[PDB]
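retry 2 of 3: previous attempt timed out while embedding lauryl dimethylamine-N-oxide. Reduced batch size to 1 and resubmitted. Inputs unchanged:
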Amino acid sequence: ALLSFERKYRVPGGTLVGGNLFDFWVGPFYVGFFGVATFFFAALGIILIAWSAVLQGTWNPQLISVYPPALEYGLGGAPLAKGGLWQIITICATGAFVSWALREVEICRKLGIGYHIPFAFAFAILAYLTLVLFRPVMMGAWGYAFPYGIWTHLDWVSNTGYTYGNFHYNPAHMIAITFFFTNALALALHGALVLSAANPEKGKEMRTPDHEDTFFRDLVGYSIGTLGIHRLGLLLSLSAVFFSALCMIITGTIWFDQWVDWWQWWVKLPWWANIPGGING
Amino acid sequence: AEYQNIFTQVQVRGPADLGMTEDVNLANRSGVGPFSTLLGWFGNAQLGPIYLGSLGVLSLFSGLMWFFTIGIWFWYQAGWNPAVFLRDLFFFSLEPPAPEYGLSFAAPLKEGGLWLIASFFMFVAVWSWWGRTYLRAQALGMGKHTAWAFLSAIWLWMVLGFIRPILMGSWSEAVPYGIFSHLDWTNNFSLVHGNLFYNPFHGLSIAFLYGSALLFAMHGATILAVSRFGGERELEQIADRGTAAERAALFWRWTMGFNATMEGIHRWAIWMAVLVTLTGGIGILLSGTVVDNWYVWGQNHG
Amino acid sequence: DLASLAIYSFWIFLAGLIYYLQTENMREGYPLENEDGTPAANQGPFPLPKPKTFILPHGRGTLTVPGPESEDRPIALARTAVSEGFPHAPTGDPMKDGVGPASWVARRDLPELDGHGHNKIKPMKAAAGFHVSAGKNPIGLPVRGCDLEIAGKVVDIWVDIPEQMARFLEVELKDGSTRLLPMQMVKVQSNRVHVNALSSDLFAGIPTIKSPTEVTLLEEDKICGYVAGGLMYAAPKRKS
Ligand code: BCL
Ligand code: BCL
Ligand code: BCL
Ligand SMILES: CC[C@H]1c2cc3[nH]c4c(c3C)C(=O)[C@H](C(=O)OC)c4c3nc(cc4[nH]c(cc(n2)[C@@H]1C)c(C(C)=O)c4C)[C@@H](C)[C@@H]3CCC(=O)OC/C=C(\C)CCC[C@H](C)CCC[C@H](C)CCCC(C)C
Ligand SMILES: CC[C@H]1c2cc3[nH]c4c(c3C)C(=O)[C@H](C(=O)OC)c4c3nc(cc4[nH]c(cc(n2)[C@@H]1C)c(C(C)=O)c4C)[C@@H](C)[C@@H]3CCC(=O)OC/C=C(\C)CCC[C@H](C)CCC[C@H](C)CCCC(C)C
Ligand SMILES: COC(C)(C)C(=O)C/C=C(\C)CC/C=C(\C)CC/C=C(\C)CCCC/C(C)=C/CC[C@H](C)CC/C=C(\C)CCC=C(C)C
Ligand SMILES: CCCCCCCCCCCC[N+](C)(C)[O-]
Ligand SMILES: CCCCCCCCCCCC[N+](C)(C)[O-]
Ligand SMILES: CCCCCCCCCCCC[N+](C)(C)[O-]
Ligand SMILES: CCCCCCCCCCCC[N+](C)(C)[O-]
Ligand SMILES: CCCCCCCCCCCC[N+](C)(C)[O-]
Ligand SMILES: CCCCCCCCCCCC[N+](C)(C)[O-]
Ligand SMILES: [Fe+3]
Ligand SMILES: [K+]
Ligand code: NA
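retry 2 succeeded.
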């Protein structure tokens, strides 16, 4: 079935691989070569998880957990039930994610729109790859990666953070959080603003973007505008994930002590390190 | 190198836009501020005008008083030495009364009384600012979505500093005013309550916080990708759907099998963000009032 | 236990919220259709919401959604397969016919208005007080298409008055007539404006506007769809 306005857009072309071989839809879903790829990678990865479940023992979603190879295996292969299933599933997952992104590119080309969406998705992929590939490789073992289980991967977050004390003190982590919080603030405001214009007090006429600029100038003295707010949301969200990947790629590699102690470089600056009083004097 | 509409190529400026009037008391609007060519590479170049009625002056006065109360305490802790002030800035902290004082106001100035004065100022600043968000919308005939969304953030704030301390019986439960110290409080809160990762409202709060970045990345990228068809003129696309709104919808239908409308995506947006602090404030309010240990609670409830 | 009641209540609220949100997002494009335009059999598990009515400003009327959907224009496409789900081939020139990435919607054939009731978008020469304030001024630059040939020259900027931004470049062609080019589809360089989407020979086919001092929503959709269509359909003429 098609949206009422959809048929005029369903023309041939835009594929990156395979010509017209996979240029078609299944219900709402566009396929393309990278739709076939995504299906293959995601099917096998899910198959191995369904398998790696019984080599572990269970069939409950809250307990199934595919752990990576122990550190002793270094960066090498591992027996299926001892971490090789995790390694293959991780290759499948990367294959599924990158294939999803390239299928998005094909959809962009057929629709004549810009590539901003798969470009943005690529930041999430790179954050994933930082935790499962770039950081383990720089640290020397797949065992530093996180396990694939709903609650076990939280265990990994807690264990990894507390290896460095209170992980709050990671400065790149502080920047990442500021972007996450500000993004959610900007999302609430944006959604509320458009809606307050499109759904004004009862019986009144729809407001205009002029009313939107006016509301925010009245409120805080500035309005970023309707183009800018979308630039902003995209930039805040990508910036958060950028500093997330950054705060982890540097942890256990160039910095591996307690993050709270990193801040001494500021306290011990020559011109105030030995002035008495305050907290550190 | 195709243009991507991240940064403006050519800025244009005209007479300063003094805004829509509707029922706004024009006497309380400033004049227009400067124009920032710097901002104009990204958003609007125009600063101001701002509306500053009585409620606004009250709120801005409390807000600075709250900020100044903290900062005067910081100068005291620094021994009035400016070099100490800058060196230890993140280490200073204005802390609430000790538990022995309970919910009383009898605590000595240097031992929680100053925290209570600063917090009182903060309470007045935030709630009067909330009234501003309602009133400025009302004056313009607009819906009250911004004020209702703001109330969701106020919820978590009220829970952390006011509702939960009151229900726990002492001001000592509240958050101190300091950069590092309020981080220490946050880590401590989790340890004392058996690890917030077992609090289901905390996990939901994370889903919505991650979800807000996912969604604004999706939406912000989508609008820029269709801005070549006027996509960001969203109110008129709601009133009279264009090819921008259709291509946006069909990108997501073809990608993930369903899609939004130009209006409805802003309902996803407002709710995704609002549920961060809504569920979060529930998770905090339940902690130590009803559940002392989320690990223990989870062993018995799932 | 109070926490366990709160988390149970919440999942019920969230299911109701998602139902509301999904049905809200069905106020356009629904009911679904077969490729031949008849109502599809499978509409999904969500019913259409109760209609709402938007009251448009400046006597423009109202919009009630959901409501009877119609394309209100001919679509020059034909099936390429005997079953559902395959592409539909243009029956003529898809840039001229406005299909595929060259599509346009039959929006109102009036200009968008600002909050005071004036035309939102005006050529800068007719916009009192408006001037380039930063960046390279494009007026006067030659315009180069993706075949690396010159297609014309910039003679003005069309600006959004209430939001104070450039929305189109007005480009004069060899025959003396002009066309609008979307600002998001041109690259302003020091010595030219480059347009990757179109070869020089396709600039004449850009849909024209009726009035030299205003552009209607319908005209903007035809302009923007046409220019974006060239990315796919001008690729045989796109060098490098
Ligand atoms: C006790 C625990 C420690 C701590 C330890 C850590 C550790 C350890 C890490 C973080 C990381 C992060 N922490 Mg910390 N953290 C703490 C306290 C906090 C607090 C707080 C209020 O106290 C906050 C707000 C944060 C915030 C954050 C973010 C900056 C970041 C998580 C987002 C991210 O990386 O996304 C990036 C996004 C992704 C990885 C998602 C990728 C998705 C992929 C591409 C696609 C998936 C598709 C899926 C399979 C599809 C399924 C099918 C469909 C559903 C149909 N931390 C404490 C002090 N924190 C993490 C980080 O930065 O990672 C880089 C991290 O590793
Ligand atoms: C990002 C930084 C940390 C980390 C820290 C945390 C913390 C801390 C928490 C979570 C939480 C969750 N995380 Mg995690 N998480 C990480 C990496 C991942 C990856 C990944 C491939 O990289 C995935 C798929 C997930 C998935 C999940 C969900 C199980 C859950 C809600 C997330 C959400 O709504 O996000 C926003 C995205 C959306 C709203 C879109 C929908 C996404 C759906 C829900 C994803 C489902 C994946 C499915 C369960 C598993 C794979 C299915 C495949 C078919 C096999 N996390 C890294 C290691 N994550 C929370 C939780 O409750 O955990 C139990 C929580 O508190
Ligand atoms: C070791 C630390 C603990 C932990 C302890 C806590 C505690 C404690 C809390 C959270 C909370 C949250 N945590 Mg946790 N958290 C941990 C691990 C994580 C990880 C991770 C990857 O490990 C993540 C992603 C998170 C993520 C999150 C967020 C989802 C949530 C806060 C939402 C928000 O927007 O707050 C930011 C928004 C606000 C505070 C609202 C503020 C509103 C007011 C009105 C603003 C006033 C402005 C004032 C006047 C100043 C004006 C400034 C000038 C105008 C410039 N936590 C670990 C397990 N976390 C909160 C929560 O809800 O938990 C359920 C919370 O209280
Ligand atoms: C970079 C900014 C944010 C971002 C952006 C972003 N994400 C995106 C996009 C964009 C722009 C898309 O276009 C794309 C999309 O289609 O969204 C609907 C996507 C998307 N982001 C998603 C999830 C997601 N994004 C997240 C985060 C973020 N996404 C960032 C915060 C998170 C978390 C944890 O924060 C999650 C869970 C999907 C809904 C979707 C990508 C779907 C996809 O790749 O589909 C192909 C793959 C499959 C259908 C299944 C593969 C299965 C694997 C082979 C096996 C499982 C492996 C996995 C490692 C197991 C993990 C277990 C967990 C318990 C840890
Ligand atoms: C729904 C969840 C998200 C949310 C939503 C939200 N927040 C909101 C709103 C909404 C919908 C508003 O409408 C409202 C607003 O107006 O935004 C523009 C607000 C807002 N959220 C704010 C902050 C905020 N929101 C946050 C978070 C979130 N907000 C959530 C993620 C956070 C954090 C911790 O993550 C913060 C810090 C404000 C920008 C604003 C509320 C403003 C307010 O209450 O102000 C009262 C205080 C004053 C008027 C004055 C304070 C004075 C300052 C302390 C300055 C001191 C410095 C100055 C330069 C002094 C001079 C000194 C020098 C001489 C040294
Ligand atoms: C250069 O120095 C000068 C003097 C110019 C300065 O001004 C310097 C200023 C500073 C250095 C300011 C420094 C300020 C900070 C570091 C602020 C840090 C604050 C935080 C990190 C806030 C964290 C969370 C705060 C919360 C959750 C507050 C909750 C507040 C309550 C909800 C309010 C409750 C009200 C109460 C308890 C009073 C009750 C009494 C009644 C009568 C109702
Ligand atoms: C969030 C950004 C805040 C920017 C605040 C800008 C305020 C502009 C008001 C300036 C007043 C100009 N004038 C002439 C009346 O003084
Ligand atoms: C508070 C004064 C109100 C109006 C002042 C406007 C300042 C704009 C300055 C011109 C901007 C151009 N410049 C030089 C920054 O590129
Ligand atoms: C302007 C503050 C409004 C009153 C609310 C806070 C009360 C302050 C209590 C400080 C205690 C002073 N004293 C004398 C008991 O030490
Ligand atoms: C309005 C958008 C709706 C998105 C809903 C996201 C659901 C994520 C579920 C995460 C599970 C959290 N928890 C606590 C049960 O573990
Ligand atoms: C809720 C978190 C993860 C949800 C899983 C993905 C949701 C399925 C949405 C796809 C529906 C497409 N469909 C059925 C209309 O074709
Ligand atoms: C949490 C995000 C996922 C929510 C799933 C929303 C519903 C997806 C199915 C919509 C059906 C589309 N359809 C077939 C009616 O057109
Ligand atoms: Fe938007
Ligand atoms: K002029
Ligand atoms: Na039709």
